[PDB]
Amino acid sequence: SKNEWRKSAIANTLLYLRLKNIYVSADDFVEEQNVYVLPKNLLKKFIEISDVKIQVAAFIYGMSAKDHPKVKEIKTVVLVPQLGHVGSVQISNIPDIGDLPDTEGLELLGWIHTQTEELKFMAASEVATHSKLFADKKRDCIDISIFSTPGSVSLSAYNLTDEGYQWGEENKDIMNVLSEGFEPTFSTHAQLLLSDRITGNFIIPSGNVWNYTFMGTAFNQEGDYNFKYGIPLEFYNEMHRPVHF
Amino acid sequence: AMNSSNYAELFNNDIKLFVDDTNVYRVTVHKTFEGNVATKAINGCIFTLNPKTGHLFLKIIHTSVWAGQKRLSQLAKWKTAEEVSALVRSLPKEEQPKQIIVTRKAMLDPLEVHMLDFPNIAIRPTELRLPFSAAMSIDKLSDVVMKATEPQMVLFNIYDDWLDRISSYTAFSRLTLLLRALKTNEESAKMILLSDPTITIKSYHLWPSFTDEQWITIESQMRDLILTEYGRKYNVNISALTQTEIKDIILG
Amino acid sequence: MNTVPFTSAPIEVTIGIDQYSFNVKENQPFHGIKDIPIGHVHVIHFQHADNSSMRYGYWFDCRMGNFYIQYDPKDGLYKMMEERDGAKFENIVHNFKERQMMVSYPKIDEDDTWYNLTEFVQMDKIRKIVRKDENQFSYVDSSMTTVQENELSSSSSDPAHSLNYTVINFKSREAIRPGHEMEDFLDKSYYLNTVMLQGIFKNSSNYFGELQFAFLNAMFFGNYGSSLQWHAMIELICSSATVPKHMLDKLDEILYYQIKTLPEQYSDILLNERVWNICLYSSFQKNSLHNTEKIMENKYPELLDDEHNPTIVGGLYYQRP
C-alpha cells in the first residue's frame, strides 16, 4: 500500500537530528598504524539517505596525503546497488570506476554502513560481507560501522584478521544463524578521524537507483553496473518504488 | 516568585512577559580522546513571550556579539538584560508589561538593574522549570536563528490561531506540553506531529493544522511520551502513579 | 562611676547592660545598676520572661544627664526617663540601703571589648537614626522598621518608631549611573566613594559608626533592618575595587570584634551566608579580611541548573567504546 511506504519515508526525514551528537571509537594513538579521515559532509549526506530500520552501505575511496602516507583521506563514497535487511546488507561487487574522469590516484579503502545494534567488533554478518568483498582483492580494506540511534551516531572503524577472512568464507551462507566459532577477535581497531576541513563527493549508479529493497527480483548481486558522479537519492525516493498503474 | 500556585495569575489582565535566556549563549563541543575540550559558539536567541497573547519576540544573538569578549556567560546575562530593556522601551506605554518573569534566577539582578527606569514593572523569578529551551526544536525558529548574519528581531505567534477557539490558559498548557515533549524525546515528539501527512503547517504557522478533535489525541500522545520517559529515567511505574502532580511534571 | 537606678522590678525580666546580663525575679527587690564606667555610650536592654519574640532597649550617654528606669504598666515596658532634679536624683543614687540592692557592672579590667565595638558610635549620630528629640536617650526594639522600607508607603508614621539608617540599595538609580549598568553593579566604587563617602557620610568615621550601631542593634535586639544595614555596609566596601586605604585597614579589626562577640544560637539567623561568602572569598577586597575570615572559620565553619556555563547544543566525542 502507498500508505505504509509514506510513514517510513517520514521517519527518515528526522535522521539528520542524530548528527548533533557524534561519537567516534578511539584509543591511544599508534604512530605506525594508518589513520582514516572521513569528510563530515559525506557522513551527513550518507545518514540523510539512510533508513531507520534497514542497513545501508557504500564503498569508500581515497588516498594518502602528500607528506604522510599513513594518513588516508576519504575522497569519494560510492553508493552501489544493494538489498538491505535489518541486521545485514547484500551489497553488489566492488564497482569499476577507473574509466570515470577525476579518479586518478584513487585507492579502494573499504566500505561504510549503518546498523541498529551497538557493538565493539564486526558482527558475523559484517565478517561474511567483508570477506566476500575483499578476501581476494585487497585484504587491508577497512569496515566503518555507524551505529545510528535516536539522539546520536557512533562510528567505529575495523580491520579484519586473516582468521576472520577465513571464517567469513567458510560461512558465506546467507542465513547466518549458526555462527559457530564466530569471534569478536576476528576484528581489530582502526584509527578514524572525522573532519570538516575537507570535502568529499559521491559516485552513484548511472540510472540513480541503488536501493533494490522493493525490487528484489530485479537485483543482481553479481551485476556489472554503470557509475557516474552525482547526488545519491534517499532510501524511499520514488525511484526506489515499483513504478505502478 | 512564580510557582504552580499563584500560577493562575498569569492569565489575568495585566500584561506580562516571560524571558528565557537559555539559548542566548550556545556552543558545540569537540572533545579529543585525551580529554581536551574546545567549544565553538553558534547563533543564539532571547525568547521573550507574552503567555496571554502568544506573541513571541525572538531576538537573535549573532556570534559576532561574542568576538573579542571575556567572561561570556556573565556577559550573556547582561546582554540579555539590555535587549529586553530596549524592547520594553520601544513599546507604547499601554503595551509595556507590569511584570517580567525570568525563567532562570541568574537573570534577576541584571534585568532589574537595566529596568531601574521603570519602578512599577515587577521583575520576578519563578520556581517553575519551564520548557522554553526546547524552542530551538521548533523548525521554523531554529531556521531563522541559524540563517541569521547579524543581530535581528523576529516576531511570531507561538499559539498560531488557537486563541480563536481556546482560552489562553488552555493554549499555554498545550504549548508547554508540546515543548516538554520535544525536550524529553525530540524525534518521538516530532513523529507524533508528523504522523498524518495530510495535515500540514500553514506558511504563517509553527504547528500543524489539527482539528479540535485531533488535538485531544495529539496532546494525549505527548502526555504518554513524557510519562513514559519519566518512568525510564527513574524506574517508577506510572500505573502505580496517582494523578498526583502530573501537572508539576509538565511544568517543572 | 555612674548609676542607673530602677524604681522597682515588678515583672520578671532578663536585663542587659552593654555586653553583660543578669535575671531579676518578679517583684524581687531591685534598685538598678551601679559602678558603670564613664565611657561614651551604653545600652540597657530587656527581655521579659513571657516573651520569646521580643527584645527592647535604650542607648544613652551618662555624661549627658541623670537617667533611670521605671516600669510603665500602660505599655507593659521598662521605660528610661531623665530626672531633671539633681537633688532628687542624687538622693536616690547615694542611698546606703538602696545601693546594696543594686548590681555591680562587672569587668575583666583589661577588657576593651565594649570600646572595640563602639569606637565610632556617638550619641549624636544615634539620635539622628532614632528620632525623638525630647529625650537624650534612644529607644530601639526587635520589631522597629527602617525608613528605607517605608519610602513607597503613603501612610503616616511616628518617626521615633522607624530606624532612619542611611538608605543603601544596590539596585537603585542612586547606585547605578545610567549607561553603566554592568560596570557599577559589579564594581561599587562610584557608589561607595562619590555617592556615600563624599556625598552623605563625609568621612569614614561616620560610616563606621553607623555600621557599628547597625551591628549592635542586630545583635541585642535581633532587629532585621539593622542586620540588612550591617551586611550592606560591609558589601559596599568589599565589592568596590577602589577603597580609601585608611578605611580598608580599619575594616578587618572592626568585623573581627563583632564576629568574636556573637553567640552561637541567634547568630545563624543573623549572619547572611551569601554576603559573607562573597566578602570573604571572591570580592575585590577579600585579602583585607584575614583576621575576620580566620575567626569565621573557627567559630562558624558550617556557614562557609547551570546558568554559569554555555548551553551545549551537541558535540563530537572521541572516546573508548
Q: Letter for the amino acid at B154? A: V
Q: Whole-angstrom Cα distance, residue C283 to residue B152?
A: 37
- φ, ψ of residue C16 in degrees (nearest 5): -115, 140
Q: Return left, alpha or beta for C179; rule: phi > 0 is left, psi -120 to 50 is alpha, else beta.
A: left
Sign of CA dihedral A96, A100, A105, A107: negative
Is the domain spanning C1-143 CATH 2.30.110.10? The answer is no
Residue listed under C-alpha cell 571464517: A167
Q: With 0-12 CB in 10 A as exposed, 13-18 as middle and 19+ as buried, what is A223?
A: middle
Residue C34 near residue C104 (C-beta atoms within 8 A): yes
Q: Would you state the cell numbers that stand for residue C122, as one nine-digit string?
A: 556617638
Listing DSSP states for C121-163 in one string gives --HHHHHHHS--TT-SSEEEETTPEESGGGTT--S---GGGEE
Q: Which residues of B touch A6 (CB under 8 A)?
A: 197
| CATH code for position B242 | 1.20.80.40
Topology (CATH level 3) of domain A1-241: Cytidine Deaminase; domain 2 (3.40.140)
Breaks (C-N over 2.5 A) in chain A follow: none
Nearest to A184, CA basis, from A135, A127, A117? A127
Pairing mode of beta strands A142-149, A152-160: antiparallel
Answer whether C267's CB lies under 8 Å from C222's CB: no
Q: Is B252 exposed, middle or buried (0-12, 13-18, 19+ CB in 10 A)?
A: middle
Name residue C61's amino acid: D
B125 & B179 share domain: no
Q: Is residue B180 domain-shared with residue B132, that is, in the same domain? A: no
Contact flag C319-A26 (C-beta cutoff 8 Å): yes
Nearest CA distance, C305 vs chain A (angstrom) = 21
Residue C275 cell numbers, joined: 554576603
Chain B positions touching A151 (Cβ under 8 A) are 186-187
Closest alpha carbon to B40 in B25, B31, B27, B30: B27
Is A21's CB within 8 Å of C317's CB? yes
CB C75 within 8 A of CB C11: no
Q: What are the chain B neighbours of A40 within 8 Å (beta carbons)?
A: none
B45-74 residues labelled b (16+ CB within 10 A) or e (exposed): bbbbbbbbebbbbbbbbbeebbeeeeebeb
Q: Closest Cα partner for B130 from B22, B238, B16, B11?
A: B22
- Under 8 Å between Cβ of B156 and B206: yes
Rounded distance between C-alpha atoms, residue A203 and residue A187, angstroms: 28
Give the single-character DSSP code of A211: B
Q: Phi and psi (nearest 5°) for A156?
A: -140, 130
Grid cell in block for residue B171: 493554549
Q: Where in chain C is the domain with CATH 1.25.40.550?
A: 144-321
> What are φ and ψ of residue A75, in 5° steps?
-105, -35
Within 8 A by CB and 6+ apart from A124, the residues are: A171, A176, A179, A182
**Interface of chain B against chain C, CB under 8 Å?**
22-23, 25-33, 39, 41-42, 44, 72-74, 76-78, 81-82, 104-107, 109-110, 112-114, 116-117, 129, 133, 136
Instruction: Measure in Å the smallest separation between the Cα of B92 and chain C Cα atoms.
Output: 21
B240: left (phi over 0), alpha (psi -120 to 50) or beta: alpha
Positive or negative torsion for Cα A15, A19, A20, A25: positive
CA–CA separation, C101 and C99 (whole Å): 5
| Residue among C223, C27, C37, C198 nearest C114 (CA) | C37
Q: Which chains touch C (3 or more CB pairs under 8 A)?
A: A, B
- Give the end of a domain, one of B132, B160, B188: B160
* CA B40/CA C313 separation, integer angstroms: 10
Q: Is A112 exposed, middle or buried (0-12, 13-18, 19+ CB in 10 A)?
A: buried
CA neighbor of B206 nearest in space, from B217, B222, B193: B193
- Residue B94 DSSP SS3: helix
Q: Which residues of C, range 281-320, sit inside 8 Å of A by Cβ?
A: 313-320
Element containing residue A166 per DSSP (H, E): helix A162-170
CATH code for position B128: 3.30.420.230
- Using a CB-CB cut-off of 8 Å, the residues of chain B touching C181 are 78, 81-82, 110, 113-114
For residue B43, what is the enclosing H or E element? none
Q: How far is CA C288 from the centre of its chain?
A: 22
- Partner-chain contact A150 B195, CB within 8 Å: no
Same domain? For B92 and B207 the reply is no
Residue range C144-321, CATH number = 1.25.40.550
Phi then psi for C75, rounded to 5 degrees?
-100, -5
Angle between helix C245-261 and helix C224-238 axes, rounded to 10 deg: 140
Strands C162-163 and A35-39: unpaired
Q: CA-to-CA distance for A205 and A192, rounded, in angstroms?
A: 27
Angle of CA points A27, A31, A36, to nearest 5°: 70
The two beta strands, C13-17 and C20-24, are antiparallel
Non-local (6+) Cβ contacts of B194 within 8 A are: A10, A13, A14
Residue of B nearest to C317 (CA): B31
Residues of C in contact with B22 (CB under 8 A): 311
The C-alpha angle with vertex A97 and arms to A96 and A101, in degrees rounded to 5, equals 155
Closest A-chain CA to C318: A24
Counting the structural domains of chain B, the total is 2
CA C71, C74, C77, C83 dihedral sign is: negative
Residue B58 pairs with which residues in a beta bridge? Answer: B47, B154
- Residue B27: list chain C partners with CB under 8 A: 310-313
The DSSP secondary-structure symbol of B13 reads S
The residues, ordered by sequence, that sit 6+ positions from C143 with a Cβ below 8 Å of its Cβ are C54, C223
Give φ, ψ of C286 to 5 degrees: -50, -35
**CA separation (Å) from A97 to A49, A58, A136, A217, A243?**
22, 14, 18, 25, 29
Query: DSSP strand E in B135-211: where?
Result: 152-157
Cβ <8 Å between A150 and B190 = no
Q: Do A17 and B191 touch (CB under 8 A)?
A: no
- Put simply, the answer to whether B194 touches A10 (Cβ < 8 Å) is yes
Q: Which of A55, A177, A58, A59 is nearest to A116 (CA)?
A: A55
- Say if residue B80 is exposed, middle or buried (CB neighbours under 10 Å; 0-12, 13-18, 19+): buried
Number of residues that make up chain A: 245
The alpha carbon dihedral of B231, B235, B239, B243 has a sign of negative
Surface-to-core class of residue B96, CB atoms within 10 Å of its CB (0-12 exposed, 13-18 middle, 19+ buried): middle
The Cα C44–Cα C17 span in angstroms is 4
Closest CA to A193 of A21, A57, A76, A22: A22
Residue matched to cell numbers 515588678? C10
Q: How far is A11 from chain B (nearest CA, A)?
A: 7
Separation between Cα atoms, residue C38 and residue C31, nearest integer Å: 20
Close Cβ partners of B127 (under 8 Å, ≥ 6 residues apart): B1, B2, B3, B4
Q: Which candidate in C311, C312, C316 is best for mutational testing of the A interface (most A CBs within 10 A)? A: C316
Those chains having 3 or more beta-carbon pairs within 8 angstroms of chain B are A, C
All residues at 6 or more sequence positions from B13 whose CB lies less than 8 Å from its CB, including other chains: none
Question: Cell triple for residue A55?
Answer: 542497513
Question: Rounded CA gap, C294 and B234, in Å?
Answer: 44
Are C314 and A194 inside 8 Å of each other by CB?
no
Please give the DSSP secondary-structure letter assigned to residue C11.
S
- Measure the CA angle with vertex A40, ends A35 and A42; round to 5°: 100
Q: Are the beta carbons of C320 and A25 separated by less than 8 Å?
A: yes
- Cβ neighbours of C280 (radius 10 Å): 19
Among B138, B111, B82, B139, residue whose Cα is nearest residue B18: B111
Interface test with C, best of B113, B141, B146, B183 (most C CBs within 10 A): B113
Nearest C-alpha of chain A: how many angstroms from C313?
Answer: 7
Q: Is A228 helix (H, G, I), strand (E, B) or coil?
A: strand
Report residue C108 as a C-alpha cell. 575583666
Final residue before a domain boundary, out of B160, B180, B202: B160
Neighbouring CB atoms inside 10 A of C227's CB total: 20
Q: How far apart are the first and last CA of chain A?
A: 13
Nearest CA in chain C to B142: C313
CB-CB under 8 Å, C305 with B78: no
- In angstroms, the separation between the Cα of residue C267 and the nearest Cα of chain A is 50
Q: What is the C-alpha separation between B137 and B129, in angstroms, rounded?
A: 17
> Could you give the CA distance from residue C240 to residue A148 in angstroms, rounded to a whole number?
55
3-class SS string, C284-311: CCHHHCHHHHHHHHHHCCCCCCCCCCCE
- B146 pairs with which residues across the strands? none
Confirm if A76 and A202 have CB atoms less than 8 A apart: yes
What amino acid is encoded at C9 in this protein?
Answer: A
Chain breaks in chain B (C to N over 2.5 A) after: none
| H or E element in which residue A116 lies | none
Task: Choose, out of C307, C308, C320, the residue to mutate when testing the contact with B (most B CBs < 10 Å).
Answer: C307
Smallest CA–CA separation between A240 and chain B, in Å? 20
For the packed helices C204-221 and C245-261, what is the interaxial angle rounded to 10 degrees? 10
Q: Which residues pair with B20 in a beta bridge?
A: B47
Answer whether A21's CB lies under 8 Å from C315's CB: yes
Sequence spans of domains, chain A? 1-241
Q: How far apart are CA C80 and CA C58, in angstroms?
A: 7
- Given an 8 Å threshold on Cβ–Cβ distance, is B114 in contact with C181? yes
Residue A78 · residue A115 · CB < 8 Å: no
Q: Nearest to residue A71, comparing CAs of A196, A200, A202, A192?
A: A192
What Rg value do the Cα atoms of chain C yield, rounded? 23
Q: Reported resolution in A?
A: 2.1
What distance in Å separates the CA atoms of residue C203 and residue C198, rounded to the nearest whole number? 7
Task: Classify residue A244 as exposed, middle or buried by CB count within 10 Å of its CB (0-12, 13-18, 19+).
Answer: exposed
- Looking at residue C263, its amino acid is P
- Residues C25 and A161: their CA atoms lie apart, in Å, by 97
Type of residue found at B176: T
Answer for the pair C32, C9: CB distance below 8 angstroms, yes or no.
no
Q: Which residue has cell 572516546?
A: C319
Q: Closest-CA residue in chain C for B75?
A: C182
CB contact under 8 A, C314 and B112: no
Q: Are strands A142-149 and A107-115 parallel, antiparallel or unpaired?
A: parallel
Please judge whether B194 and A28 are an interchain contact, meaning their C-beta atoms are less than 8 angstroms apart: no
Residue B53 pairs in a beta bridge with none
Letter for the amino acid at C320?
Answer: R
Query: CB B194 to CB A27 under 8 A?
Result: no
Mutation site for C-interface testing, chosen from A17, A18, A21 by largest number of C Cβ within 10 Å: A21
What is the β-pairing status of strands C42-48 and C56-60? Answer: antiparallel
Contact B77 C307 (CB under 8 A): yes
- DSSP, res A29: -
Beta-carbon contacts below 8 Å between A and B: 24
Backbone region of residue C202 per phi and psi (left: phi > 0; alpha: psi in -120 to 50; beta: other values)? left
HSE-up of residue A69 (Cα within 13 Å, Cβ side)? 1
CB contact under 8 A, A14 and B195: no
Q: How far is CA A68 from CA A64, A71, A73, C129, in A?
A: 7, 6, 10, 81
CB atoms within 10 A of CB B24: 24
CA-CA distance, A60 to C128, in Å (whole number)? 87
Q: What's at B163, amino acid-wise?
A: L
The boundaries of every CATH 2.60.34.20 domain in chain C are 1-143
Burial class (CB in 10 A: 0-12, 13-18, 19+), B157: middle
Pairing of strands C311-319, B26-31: parallel
Return the beta strands (E) in B80-128 as ranges: 99-102, 122-124
Chain C closest-CA separation from residue A42 CA (Å): 15
Cβ–Cβ below 8 Å for A22 and C320 = no
A91 and A133 in contact (C-beta within 8 Å)? yes
Asked if residues C117 and C257 have their Cβ atoms less than 8 Å apart, the reply is yes
Query: CA B49, CA C300: separation in Å to the nearest integer?
Result: 45
Enter the DSSP assignment of C95: -
Q: How many other CB atoms are found less than 10 A from the CB of residue B41?
A: 19
Task: Find the domain containing B206 and state its range.
Answer: 161-252
Backbone angles phi, psi at A21, to 5 degrees: -120, 110
C-alpha cell at C305: 541548573
| CA–CA separation, C246 and C280 (whole Å) | 19
d(CA B125, CA B100): 9
Calpha distance A145→A23 (Å, rounded): 12
How far is residue B217's CA from residue C218's CA, in Å, rounded to a whole number?
A: 60
| A152-160 vs C42-48, strand pairing mode | unpaired
> How far is C224 from A191, CA to CA, in rounded Å?
66
Residue A194's φ and ψ, nearest 5 degrees, are: -95, 140
Give me the count of residues in chain B: 252
Q: Rounded to whole angstroms, how far apart are CA atoms B201 and B160?
A: 10
**Taking a C-beta distance cutoff of 8 angstroms, is the pair B219, B174 a contact?**
yes
Q: How far apart are the first and last CA of chain B?
A: 14
How many C-beta atoms surround the C-beta of residue C130 within 10 A?
22
From residue C63, alpha-carbon distances to C4, C41, C200 in Å are 12, 9, 28
Q: Show the cell assigned to B140.
A: 521554523
And the C-alpha cell for C120?
A: 565610632
Give the count of Cβ contacts less than 8 A between chain B and C: 75
Neighbours of chain A (3+ CB pairs under 8 A): B, C
Helix ranges, chain C (H): 86-93, 96-99, 113-118, 123-129, 181-186, 189-190, 204-221, 224-238, 245-261, 267-270, 273-281, 290-299
